Amino acid sequence: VCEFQFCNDPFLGVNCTFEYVS
């Protein structure tokens, strides 16, 4: 839940209060 900077059009290729990793 970080104050993230996102791309104009986020995609995937082939200050934080909470963090969890499975």
Ligand X SMILES: *[C@@H]1O[C@H](CO)[C@@H](O)[C@H](O)[C@H]1NC(C)=O
Q: Using CB under 8 A as the criterion, which residues of the chain lie in contact with other proteins when the complex forms?
A: 16-18, 20
E strand or H helix that includes residue 9:
none
18 binds ligand X (CB under 6 A): no
Contact of residue 3 among ligand X, other proteins, none (CB under 5-8 Å per partner type): ligand X
Q: Please state, in angstroms and rounded to a whole number, the distance separating the CA atoms of residues 21 and 12.
A: 18
Q: Smallest distance from the beta carbon of 18 to other proteins, in angstroms?
A: 6
5 binds ligand X (CB under 6 A): no
Q: Please state, in angstroms and rounded to a whole number, the distance separating the CA atoms of residues 18 and 20.
A: 7
Give the one residue of 15, 17, 19, 20 binding ligand X; rule: CB under 6 A: 15
Q: Please state, in angstroms and rounded to a whole number, the distance separating the CA atoms of residues 16 and 3.
A: 7
